[PDB]
Amino acid sequence: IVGGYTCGANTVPYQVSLNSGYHFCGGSLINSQWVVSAAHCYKSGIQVRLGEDNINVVEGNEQFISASKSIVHPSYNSNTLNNDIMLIKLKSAASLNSRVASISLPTSCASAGTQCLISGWGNTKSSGTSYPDVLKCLKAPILSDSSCKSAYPGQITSNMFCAGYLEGGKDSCQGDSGGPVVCSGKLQGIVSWGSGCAQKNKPGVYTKVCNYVSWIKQTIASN
């Protein structure tokens, strides 16, 4: 997260991270056994970590649970990043509490201007590279589809939306992928891609979760 602030330990209780050798993506806990993250985060042999703040210290509230199933959307395209959503089943259910809690799925789509919370452990610089110890947070408004499409001509599908600032300075970044974009208590977005981070007229692009609520249900109920 570039130009964000320090969330505070366990203030974002649905935030999880995806691990294989290091932190490489975020994710969102949507129930005790299922994580929603980005399809381009797919890896064999993943471990999900829940209840973290300082990823580099064992603080006491963590749960590290192996991923038993990783179900990439069947229409996922890795060139265009169309349908960049993944469901991860946990090997055993997370113990839910004040610091490990699920986030609600949307019941309708969010409109332009809706302020959202974006979180992750990704890069905090747009000019360089710095990876934070503690979870970072960003408040960002969803942008109109018009300015989004203009920012990235011919690249935005109806399964993506932009959020952030046309003037730059605040954005999600490398390592934030799969992470939550939460608007009024609902998971509306998954950190997907962008052209650099926090650049002028290059807002971050996000998986439009409200498109996938039915696909998520069916997948959870068949797996």
Partner 1 sequence: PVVDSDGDAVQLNLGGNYPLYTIQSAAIGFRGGLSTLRKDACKSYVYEAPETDRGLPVGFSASATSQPVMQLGSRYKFSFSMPVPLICDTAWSIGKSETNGGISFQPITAGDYFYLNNFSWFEARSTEETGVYKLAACSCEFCKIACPEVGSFNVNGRTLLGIGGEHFTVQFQKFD
Residue ranges for the known binding site for Ca(2+) are 52, 54, 57, 62
Burial state string for 45-57 with b = 16 or more CB within 10 A and e = fewer than 16: ebbbbbbbbebee
CB of 56 to partner 1, least distance (A): 13
Q: Among Na ion, partner 1, Ca ion, none, what does residue 44 contact (CB within 5–8 Å per kind)?
A: Ca ion
Of 29, 26, 39, 31, nearest to 70 (Cα)?
39
| Identified catalytic residue from 37, 119, 177, 192 | 177
Contacts with partner 1 by CB under 8 A lie at 21-25, 38, 40-41, 78, 81, 84, 122-123, 125-131, 152, 155, 168-169, 172-177, 191-197, 199-200, 204-205
The interface partner of residue 17, options being partner 1, Ca ion, Na ion, none and the CB cut-off 5 to 8 Å by kind, is Ca ion
Active site residue 40: yes
**Closer Cβ to partner 1, 33 or 53, answer by number:** 53
The pair of structure tokens assigned to 171 is 């954005």
If binding is defined by CB under 5 A, does position 107 make contact with Ca ion?
Answer: no
- Mark the breaks in the chain: residue after which each occurs, C to N over 2.5 Å: none
| 84 belongs to the catalytic site | yes
Residues comprising the chain, all counted? 223
From the annotation, which residues make up the binding site? 52, 54, 57, 62, 171-172, 174-175, 177
Does residue 174 belong to the site contacting Ca ion (CB under 5 A)?
no
Instruction: Please choose which of partner 1, Ca ion, Na ion, none residue 186 contacts, taking the beta carbon within 5 to 8 angstroms, the exact cut-off set by kind.
Output: Na ion
Q: Does residue 158 have an active-site annotation?
A: no
121 binds Ca ion (CB under 5 A): yes
Alpha-carbon torsion angle 219, 159, 177, 31, nearest 10: -30
The residues of the shown chain that bind Na ion, judged by CB under 5 A, are 106-108, 186, 195
Q: Which residues are catalytic?
A: 40, 84, 177
